[PDB]
């Protein structure tokens, strides 16, 4: 009926990690190759590269992420990166105009903006549709942050060695998550499941991204516009 | 005493290739990651990547460059790229303020600008000193363009297979070069040699760039700021 000291240390830790790695001002966005509205590919690529960087920083600060092997950190990051990015982008997503809005109109990404980076306007449907549902759940910062750490710490990913110690870390986080809602979120008797459903939503979005990403990554005139980080994270090289 | 029709076709061809690949307005420079005055590394990296692209385009248009094997094209481009880039940058170099000036002050590269991309202010001396000498020679567009094609077509590079057919192409170009000066450049009885000396100057600058480039390319936090093209051209992978 009340969260325990350690469940609270965990929440505190994650919240800060996210403040420390999610720039509310989006001030770094002027250092990206500018948007031109595959004319958006250089900018989005930089946005995604940058975002991978934040995600990595966030992860390092998840309780017991660092005690994992380098190999598992990499395995978890590579497979979960795009999902974390999709999740975190929800903070900039806006229901009023169905667009991610990043502190200025040079940094407003609408659905046409995005077709201009090589994706089909209709394999983007699920992503928008997902941001809108996620948004509707009016997550607490605590829960948003918790969902991301739970995502990252999915042991059901290609390449993970210790899917027993990662299961442990995840379970602990779902424990925190589930209590938090119960104890601290009026009207959320049904939320945990809605969120968990979002984790499965993500898997599919992940799948879809990989298919399009494979398409671009195979045409050198496109791959050349990515960054070394993107190429490495989204690449199929194997530890 | 007068250049032959074919020597003139060659000159015409090179001049155009250079117009077709050297944007006098430098209008593409707004698509680079902006300069911040290793804070200049993202911008210069984009400048260099872009420049490699032009150089490649130029090369393709050199008489008989395309009839070479893919392998030799690559071998010639990889080893000569930085030299061509250094040469071509002379068009934007200014004696009045010892700086490359690219159509706007966001695009004025002075020597401090450059230390901020990871190089020593004193392994840059030779490069500035070289631009200044090159500038002093007040090359005709014809000769500037000819020197670049002669550079590219140096057969004394690592990896070149047919250093007999490339020697042929180069010789032919030096023939054109040498006649052009004789027939069309008053006061240039000594120039060809001064230029040829510049080709050897370049080799050393090349050497020096490789040493610094190796330094940056080995620290992932730096290599990550380069582009796929830069990494590939300047990389040591072997055909």
């Amino acid at each position: 009926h009340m969260l325990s000291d350690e469940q609270m240390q965990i929440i505190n830790s994650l919240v800060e990690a996210h403040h420390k790695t999610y720039d509310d001002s989006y001030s770094d966005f002027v250092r990206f190759r500018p948007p031109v509205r595959l004319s958006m590919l250089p900018h989005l690529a930089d946005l995604v590269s940058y975002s991978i960087q934040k995600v990595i920083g966030f992860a390092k600060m998840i309780p017991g992420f660092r005690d994992l092997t380098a190999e598992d950190q990499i395995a978890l990051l590579k497979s979960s990166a795009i999902e974390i990015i999709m999740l975190r982008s929800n903070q900039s997503f806006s229901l009023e105009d169905m667009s991610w809005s990043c502190g200025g109109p040079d940094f407003k990404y609408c659905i046409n903006d995005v077709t201009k980076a090589g994706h089909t306007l209709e394999l983007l449907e699920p992503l928008v549709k997902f941001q809108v549902g996620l948004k509707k759940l009016k997550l607490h910062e605590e829960e948003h942050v918790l969902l991301m750490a739970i995502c990252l710490l999915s042991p059901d990913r290609p390449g993970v060695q210790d899917h027993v110690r990662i299961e442990a870390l995840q379970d602990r986080l779902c424990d925190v998550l589930q209590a938090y809602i119960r104890i601290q979120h009026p009207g959320g008797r049904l939320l945990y499941a809605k969120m968990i459903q979002k984790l499965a939503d993500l898997r599919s979005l992940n799948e879809e991204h990989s298919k399009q990403y494979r398409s671009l990554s195979f045409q050198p005139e496109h791959s050349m516009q990515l960054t070394p980080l993107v190429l490495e994270v989204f690449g199929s090289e194997v530890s | 005493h007068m250049l032959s029709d074919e020597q003139m076709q060659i000159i015409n061809s090179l001049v155009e290739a250079h117009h077709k690949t050297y944007d006098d307005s430098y209008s593409d420079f707004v698509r680079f990651r902006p300069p911040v005055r290793l804070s200049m590394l993202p911008h210069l990296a984009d400048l260099v990547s872009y420049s490699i692209q032009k150089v490649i385009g130029f090369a393709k248009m050199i008489p008989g460059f395309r009839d070479l094997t893919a392998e030799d094209q690559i071998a010639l481009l990889k080893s000569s790229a930085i030299e061509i880039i250094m040469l071509r940058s002379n068009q934007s170099f200014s004696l009045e303020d010892m700086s490359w000036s690219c159509g706007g002050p966001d695009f004025k590269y002075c020597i401090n600008d450059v230390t901020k991309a990871g190089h020593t202010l004193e392994l840059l001396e030779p490069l500035v000193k070289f631009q200044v000498g090159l500038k002093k020679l007040k090359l005709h567009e014809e000769e500037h363009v000819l020197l670049m094609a002669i550079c590219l077509l140096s057969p004394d590079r690592p990896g070149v297979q047919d250093h007999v057919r490339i020697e042929a192409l180069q010789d032919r170009l030096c023939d054109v070069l040498q006649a052009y000066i004789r027939i069309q450049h008053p006061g240039g009885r000594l120039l060809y040699a001064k230029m040829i000396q510049k080709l050897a100057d370049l080799r050393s600058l090349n050497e020096e760039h490789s040493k610094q480039y190796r330094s940056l390319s080995f620290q992932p936090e730096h290599s990550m700021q380069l582009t796929p093209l830069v990494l590939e051209v300047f990389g040591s992978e072997v055909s």
Partner: peptide, 10 residues
Amino acid sequence: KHKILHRLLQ
């Protein structure tokens, strides 16, 4: 393999 991820994980 994974030059940069490794570096950013130290």
